[PDB]
Amino acid sequence: NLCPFGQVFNASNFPSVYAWERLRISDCVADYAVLYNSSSSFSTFKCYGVSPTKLNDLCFSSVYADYFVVKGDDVRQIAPAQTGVIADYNYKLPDDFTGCVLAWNTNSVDSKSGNNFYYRLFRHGKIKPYERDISNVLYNSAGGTCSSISQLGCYEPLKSYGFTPTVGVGYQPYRVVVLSFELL
Amino acid sequence: TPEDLAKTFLDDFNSAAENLSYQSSLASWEYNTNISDENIQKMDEAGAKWSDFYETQSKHAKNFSLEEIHNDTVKLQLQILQQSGSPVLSEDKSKRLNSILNAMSTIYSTGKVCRPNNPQECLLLEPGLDNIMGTSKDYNERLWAWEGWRAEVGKQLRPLYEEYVVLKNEMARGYHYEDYGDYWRRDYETEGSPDLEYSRDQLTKDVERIFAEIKPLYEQLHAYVRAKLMDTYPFHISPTGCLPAHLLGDMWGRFWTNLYPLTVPFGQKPNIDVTDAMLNQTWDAKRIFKEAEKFFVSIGLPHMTEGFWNNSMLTDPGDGRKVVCHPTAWDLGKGDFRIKMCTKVTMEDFLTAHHEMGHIQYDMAYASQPYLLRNGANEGFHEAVGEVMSLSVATPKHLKTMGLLSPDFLEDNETEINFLFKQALTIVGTLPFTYMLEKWRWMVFKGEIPKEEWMTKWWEMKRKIVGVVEPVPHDETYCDPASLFHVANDYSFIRYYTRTIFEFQFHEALCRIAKHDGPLHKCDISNSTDAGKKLHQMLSVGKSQPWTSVLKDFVDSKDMDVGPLLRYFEPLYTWLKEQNRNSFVGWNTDWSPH
Ligand SMILES: [Zn+2]
């Protein structure tokens, strides 16, 4: 059969930044020629390690796909050796990350009045490469742990994006999916 | 680490205040685009949820010590947060105060001056009472529209303003300020280096010092205005006394721009008017704002956002939408910038299509700043970015390259005065009125003016400072100062004085980086990317640095200068002297028209 990129690129619902969904893809054939000239929709097609047009000839095994929704100016933090909020608390890529981080604007679909996307914004530590933090809805204290919101130094982590369709560019939902082309 | 406890507290604030104020500003946008009973209740409930978040986080910020914080970036954010919240007023008086502010705006907006002969027809100020006060020249007709606005909206606002100066004074003393006037002089307050330090009482010392240097230019301007208006009013103007306060420009006498058909230096020269030129060409309300985007993008400032044109209300909508359409440049947050203005194609709206587009590209500039540091350097810095674009666009050399002016419009020595006198009516003609309206209120809130002497010392400062005399006697039953929009709706009016001093201080600084060789009024910073990189350096700091440091790095002067304003009108100030040789330069306080 072909490669199941329809469930990755054209999925019905994408998750938030912290609870991103991992799909392990192996033993597939994909048409990267039509994905190479798809720049009319994809706002970001940055690649690392390999050329965008040369990966079709190379055979990769156990290709991972981490797909999520960030805001418009948070697509810069899906790069290797990048520092920021979601590059250290939500989703961190290693320095030897090979593949193409793929992002496109989704202000029309992923910014309705019922959707809700969150980010971590508060954690005691640095997120490891390819580490998925679980949905830990627990209040973060400045020192140790706390119980309720009224305690000083105690802030809830999961701050939601205010995704309305009327926000300006940079604060609009961008569906980011990486393609970690692991080799051998 | 005391820094990291306050660093993450602001990150708790900035990740929660950004969404709570964006829904507050979207509900504020929905009230200001169509007024309904279902829109006010969505506005204030979001406006009080943000106000509950305003005062809850302010109390948590006071647990941090500013002395143990050794980072100036988070110290200034804590200084705004510790000093804005928890008013000392009770629950009953806060409902009383919000009832007053919602009544003074309702009396001013829904108020209307009906004719005493026939009270059926009645002008609700829009449209009405500004074509009369802006174009008509009759003495007995403008007296009705001026005194009538001080009667219908004056007697109905005096008891609301007598309680306004008490509750807001008590509210200001809850933040340990002395009076409500000292609560308004906090945008100019500066703490930091001893040389770059600006106290709240140094503003009153500097503004009085600046007006002592404006007054040689203004009194020659006032003498030439009175001499030219003496031909239009041959019986109701004394040749050595004060001008009538109702015959000058607007209704209140703020701008003198409507006197340019009457006070014209050379009537035999063609006008610099763009109103008839835009109507004769293909020029809609989009190109009012689309061509203004071309001026900002010519100097290196970025384009408007893709959601700017879709979301802004650039024109008055149909389908029976009741909208208050005062021109305001909304920064709703989260990268969303809008303009709420119902344009009417004239020369006045073409310049406010750069003034409202001057807050934009300033709001777009400090978007990389933290959320609390997302204002101007002061309130006069924010209003001067748009108006310094009203100096480089309104030049006849720039209108010739725009195509809106004829190619045969030669710049003679007489058209250097027609343009400059029009810039003297708008800009120099508003400096004494803006100064004393924020000198009357600064003494009313202090207690220097008792409540039984409000209107006595209001006109005693109109004659001495501005040079205007009331056409009818006013007792204490009237409230003429509260007839303005910025006074009845609780707005600071010292923006328009301090932005004018910064309007030409920015302009002379921009024209020396643009390598302009010539007079200051002939300058044009268009198509110059070097005069926009230094402007955007000034715009991108926001309120991160004190305004005495932002001004020093931009115009190479620390304090407010008026020398750039005088050098702009130095070709006119020489010409104003030779025309006022026969006439008298000054005004007499004791003269009364009645
Ligand atoms: Zn403005």
Numbering used by the authors:
A (entry chain A): 324 to 507
B (entry chain B): 20 to 613
The publication says:
The ability of sarbecoviruses to enter host cells depends on the binding of the spike (S) protein to its receptor. Angiotensin-converting enzyme 2 (ACE2) has been reported to be an entry receptor for many sarbecoviruses. Certain sarbecoviruses utilize angiotensin-converting enzyme 2 (ACE2) as their cellular receptor, whereas some do not, speculatively due to the two deletions in their receptor-binding domain (RBD). Notably, many sarbecovirus RBDs exhibit deletions in either of the region 2, the receptor binding ridge, or both regions.
